[PDB]
Amino acid sequence: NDTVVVGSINFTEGIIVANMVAEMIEAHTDLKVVRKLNLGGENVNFEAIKRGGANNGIDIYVEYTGHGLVDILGFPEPNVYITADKQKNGIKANFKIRHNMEDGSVQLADHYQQNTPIGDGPVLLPDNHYLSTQSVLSKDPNEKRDHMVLLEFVTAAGITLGMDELSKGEELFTGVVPILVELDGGVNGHKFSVRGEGEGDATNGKLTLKFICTTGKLPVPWPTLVTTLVQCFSRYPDHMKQHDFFKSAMPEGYVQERTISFKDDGTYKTRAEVKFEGDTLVNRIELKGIDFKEDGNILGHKLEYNFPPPSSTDPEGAYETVKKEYKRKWNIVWLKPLGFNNTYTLTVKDELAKQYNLKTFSDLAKISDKLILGATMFFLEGPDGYPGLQKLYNFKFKHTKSMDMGIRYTAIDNNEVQVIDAWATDGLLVSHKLKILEDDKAFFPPYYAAPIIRQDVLDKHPELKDVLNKLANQISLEEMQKLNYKVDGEGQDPAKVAKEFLKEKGLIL
Ligand SMILES: c1cnc2cc3c(cc2n1)[C@@H]1CNC[C@H]3C1
């Protein structure tokens, strides 16, 4: 029982950090340590550590906060990605909601959305951006009716202020606006009505609403109706205020049509008119749900009364969100960060960048048709990589070829490929005369690495927390770059560099 399991993915950095963790545990404790190295897969560690060292899994492994968000929250999907549809003079939007269940499961809700101005006046057709939403569901203790108290914060992002620059409907949201919401719905023949009253502050992006089921008991769980039940109250920062389509349609309003597909269950089809009446912003919705299962998760009320927390783009917020959602669900402890952010970045030959005056990803996308992308498997398959990039940046590459790590640097050196997915810790970025490009639309989450341990393993031997926090903020990105290079440039074995570093900083000896 004295032994423990430490897992790792198969890439240069992960093996090194796993050997570092093992050396720490064997030095500052008298514990036996195993070094498991799982390969391939899709989010493999997560499953291995869900199993544990007893079920031939893992107990401790190093994870990055962005991939953690992808694990627990499915990072790119909860963001409401908005693009412009010039045909219908409006906008289109895509996202997914992950409804928690009692048995740790997740019910998927795929949202496709169209918005079309009701009036015939001019409206703002925006560039690709996204809405980040935080939703808090609660109850009134004194309300005997079936209800939901909802409090929302919506902020727009995905557009940069480049220190180079400076509507009629917006003037209607300067103060606090009353909000009426009326939803007439039918799901599998169940007819119901929901009436919600509240207020909205668009300058802060805050919504405070109370919804009541005026027809008795609601035949569906409340969180499935949260998206359906006022995107004009989103806080748009000044530097992208000319991209708020919703406020520009006011006071005439807009039609919001939505198709919500529940995985392995029925679907909602909703049409709403969001418009001003007197001084009140009203949202009138007709909802028709069909093909639902009577004992399913929706018609069986198998969804918890909560909402997944928002996947933040701020490093501190990202770390804390991932730590909280790992501890709450699946009972997994995030330890202190090692102090280096190994993020994806689209790097080019700096000669090419000088030739085409490429500074940011947006500059790269406008000429992406002439270029070839050589990316790793994890960047072409992971939703936090190229597929998630494309729903914000509109990259149109001529070719995309998955390549083993290290092959991509020697391939961009010989112009077999123009753009590669360089990881910031690869020491090869300086030695190949390359250039990282600015992720101006801020799609990528923070990828600060930190170790991860199970709670029961932390309980059987309680000293592991302190012995693994010896590495907290000890490895800078440039330090890790030198060591990664020692493994990738020179032929040195991974464990040797780990022992050397821990001797150098006075940890292993
Ligand atoms: C799936 C699971 N974990 C990953 C960790 C990393 C990557 C891709 C992954 N894909 C690289 C990008 N950021 C941290 C490293 C390296």
Gap from CA of 447 to ligand 1 centroid (Å) = 8
β-bridge mates for residue 376, sequence order: none
Sheet holding 449-454, edge to edge: 32-35, 3-6, 60-64, 449-454, 332-334
Taking the CA of residue 449 as reference, the ligand 1 atom at the shortest distance is 14
> Taking the C-alpha atoms of 283, 178, 250 and 232 in order, what is their torsion angle to the nearest 10 degrees?
-70
Q: What is the CA 361 to chain-centroid distance, rounded?
A: 19
Q: Tell me the two tokens of residue 133.
A: 């939403």
Domain around 404: 341-437
Ligand 1 contact via 64 beta carbon (within 6 Å): yes
Ligand 1 contact via 485 beta carbon (within 6 Å): no
Q: Tell me the two tokens of residue 33.
A: 């340590």
Do 45 and 62 form a contact (C-beta atoms < 8 A)?
Answer: no
**Side-chain half-sphere CA neighbours of 39 within 13 A:** 0
Gap from CA of 106 to ligand 1 centroid (Å) = 23
Gap from CA of 414 to ligand 1 centroid (Å) = 26
Distance (Å, whole) CA 21 – CA 34: 11
Residue 60's contacts (CB-CB under 8 Å, 6 or more residues apart) are 4, 5, 6, 7, 21, 25, 451, 452, 453, 454, 457, 464, 468
**Closest residue CA from atom 7 of ligand 1:** 378
Gap from CA of 376 to ligand 1 centroid (Å) = 10
Sheet holding 399-402, edge to edge: 399-402, 372-375, 419-423, 344-349, 434-436
* Helix or strand (DSSP H, E) at 362: helix 361-365
Put residue 464 in one of left, alpha, beta given phi > 0 → left and psi -120 to 50 → alpha.
alpha
Residue 460 one-letter amino acid? K
Gap from CA of 115 to ligand 1 centroid (Å) = 36
Q: Tell me the two tokens of residue 7.
A: 């897992």
SS3 458: helix
Ligand 1 contact via 312 beta carbon (within 6 Å): no
Q: How many helices (H) and strands (E) does the chain have?
A: 15, 21
Gap from CA of 378 to ligand 1 centroid (Å) = 6
Q: What is the CA 293 to chain-centroid distance, rounded?
A: 30
Tell me how many degrees the CA angle 445-65-152 measures, rounded to the nearest 5: 65
Ligand 1 contact via 382 beta carbon (within 6 Å): yes
Secondary structure percentages of the chain, helix, strand, coil, to 5: 30, 30, 40
Ligand 1 contact via 340 beta carbon (within 6 Å): no
**Closest residue CA from atom 2 of ligand 1:** 43
Distance (Å, whole) CA 329 – CA 310: 15
For residue 357, the domain's CATH number is 3.40.190.120
Distance (Å, whole) CA 495 – CA 481: 16
User: b or e along 172-191 (b: 16 or more beta carbons within 10 Å of the residue's beta carbon)?
Assistant: bbeeebebbbbbebebbeee
Ligand 1 contact via 268 beta carbon (within 6 Å): no
SS3 160: coil
In the DSSP assignment, the letter for residue 224 is G
Beta-strand pair 419-423/344-349: antiparallel
Resolution of the model in angstroms: 3.2
What are the strands, taking DSSP E only, across 362-456?
A: 372-375, 399-402, 419-423, 434-436, 449-454
Residue 309 one-letter amino acid? P
Q: Tell me the two tokens of residue 65.
A: 């906060």
| 362 burial level (CB within 10 Å; 0-12, 13-18, 19+) | buried
Do 429 and 436 form a contact (C-beta atoms < 8 A)?
Answer: yes
| 139 burial level (CB within 10 Å; 0-12, 13-18, 19+) | exposed
The label of the residue with tokens 């919401």 reads: 181
Q: How was this structure determined?
A: X-ray
User: b or e along 76-105 (b: 16 or more beta carbons within 10 Å of the residue's beta carbon)?
Assistant: bbbbbbbbbeeeebbbebbbbbbbbeeeee
By C-alpha distance, which of 335, 441, 328, 420 is closest to 371? 420
Crossing angle of helices 477-488 and 494-504, in 10° steps, is 150
Crossing angle of helices 12-28 and 494-504, in 10° steps, is 50
Taking the CA of residue 66 as reference, the ligand 1 atom at the shortest distance is 13
Do 85 and 91 form a contact (C-beta atoms < 8 A)?
Answer: yes
The label of the residue with tokens 């996202």 reads: 95
**Backbone φ, ψ for residue 32 (5° rounding):** -80, 145
By C-alpha distance, which of 13, 3, 8, 9 is closest to 448? 13
Ligand 1 contact via 344 beta carbon (within 6 Å): yes
One DSSP character per residue, 315-347 reads: HHHHHHHHHHHHHHSS-EEE----S-B--EEEE
Q: Tell me the two tokens of residue 331.
A: 């009972």
Report the chain's terminal Cα–Cα distance, integer Å. 26
By C-alpha distance, which of 257, 195, 190, 266 is closest to 224? 266
Do 395 and 379 form a contact (C-beta atoms < 8 A)?
Answer: no
Ligand 1 contact via 423 beta carbon (within 6 Å): yes
